Nucleic acid binder design. Sequence first.
RNA 1: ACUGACGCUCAGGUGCGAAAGCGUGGGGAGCAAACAGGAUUAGAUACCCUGGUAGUCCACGCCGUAAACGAUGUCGACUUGGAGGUUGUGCCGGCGUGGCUUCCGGAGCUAACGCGUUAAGUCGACCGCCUGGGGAGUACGGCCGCAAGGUUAAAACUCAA
RNA 2: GGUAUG
Lengths: 102, 70
Amino acid sequence: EKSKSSKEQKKKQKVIQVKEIKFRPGTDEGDYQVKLRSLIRFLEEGDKAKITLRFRGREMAHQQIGMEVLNRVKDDLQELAVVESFPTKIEGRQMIMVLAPK
Amino acid sequence: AKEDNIEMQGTVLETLPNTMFRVELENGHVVTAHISGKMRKNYIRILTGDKVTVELTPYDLSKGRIVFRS
RNA sequence: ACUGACGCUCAGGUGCGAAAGCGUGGGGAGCAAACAGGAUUAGAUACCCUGGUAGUCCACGCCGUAAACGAUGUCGACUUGGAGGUUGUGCCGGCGUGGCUUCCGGAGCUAACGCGUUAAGUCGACCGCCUGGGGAGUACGGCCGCAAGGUUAAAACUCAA
RNA sequence: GGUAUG
Ligand SMILES: C[C@H]1O[C@H](O[C@H]2[C@H](O)[C@@H](O)[C@@H](O)[C@H](O)[C@@H]2O)[C@@H](N)C[C@@H]1NC(=N)C(=O)O
Ligand SMILES: [K+]
Ligand SMILES: [K+]
Ligand SMILES: [K+]
Ligand SMILES: [K+]
Ligand SMILES: [K+]
Ligand SMILES: [Mg+2]
Ligand SMILES: [Mg+2]
Ligand SMILES: [Mg+2]
Ligand SMILES: [Mg+2]
Ligand SMILES: [Mg+2]
Ligand SMILES: [Mg+2]
Ligand SMILES: [Mg+2]
Ligand SMILES: [Mg+2]
Ligand SMILES: [Mg+2]
Ligand SMILES: [Mg+2]
Ligand SMILES: [Mg+2]
């Protein structure tokens, strides 16, 4: 009968979901700031943050311009998140850095 | 009969609206360049990072026409 | 039966004016901006779900705006028809005769769509308004407002729509 | 149940 409150006591600690924010090589400053405010909000709630960077076409041939962005995000989210994964290579046409709450 | 253009080599720093580009030249001056007509019509895409030939004018050394992408 | 042109229109003026909103005080079921949470999602400051405050209601006072629309100013006259609705009335269910109103259509009008005796037809009276797009119903000034704002209302500039 | 992008 009293499973009702047991189920509640289970649910009262949240399951960590993974929120995805997707950048591009040429994401401009103001738009970057919006996405960063998104990530700050996600990590302060205790959610993981699968940050992706999608290359398109011949932007593939300038990988480091992308890598710069992911490095920038890591640095900005340094006193808040910890890098659970950093991309070495372009897998497909993407580079996935998982952050996670401290 | 036209006066001669300085062709200089350079790297695209930013893509601006409407096929305009900041380009750092070899000499180190950052010109605002625009795509050539031939390139526009032949769909040669220019990106941040790309190596480009820039035709320049002595009349204004802040401006140039991107004529080739390597 | 009576009055005997006493009329029509109206800048300024005065009033009325959906909802939201504002002030003071009531009231508060339902609903519900904001908000809280649950989801959905690449993100989802939404749509969906659970709630939920102002508000919605009343009194008094304010506000004065809406696709406040027929996107059609008011008054009068004239100009083929058809089918209805609604509300009087006269006469012998029928035959008239008024008011309001819905739809179709003729001439005519219209860029066309369409309008078409309830005209966007044919005329007359008076008023309001327009003069390329954006800038802008914005700025400045005035007036009004507790405030939100409202009203009156430009220009530079830029475009070749 | 949202048919993001040839
Ligand atoms: C269902 C989505 O519909 C609308 O977005 C459509 C988009 O999803 C594509 O099907 C095409 O680009 C269409 O041309 C767009 O109209 C747009 N209103 C956003 C909606 N999506 C969401 N609300 C959602 O995914 O969530
Ligand atoms: K008068
Ligand atoms: K309430
Ligand atoms: K026609
Ligand atoms: K003009
Ligand atoms: K004013
Ligand atoms: Mg009200
Ligand atoms: Mg009140
Ligand atoms: Mg409710
Ligand atoms: Mg709701
Ligand atoms: Mg108005
Ligand atoms: Mg109406
Ligand atoms: Mg009007
Ligand atoms: Mg009058
Ligand atoms: Mg008709
Ligand atoms: Mg007309
Ligand atoms: Mg104003």
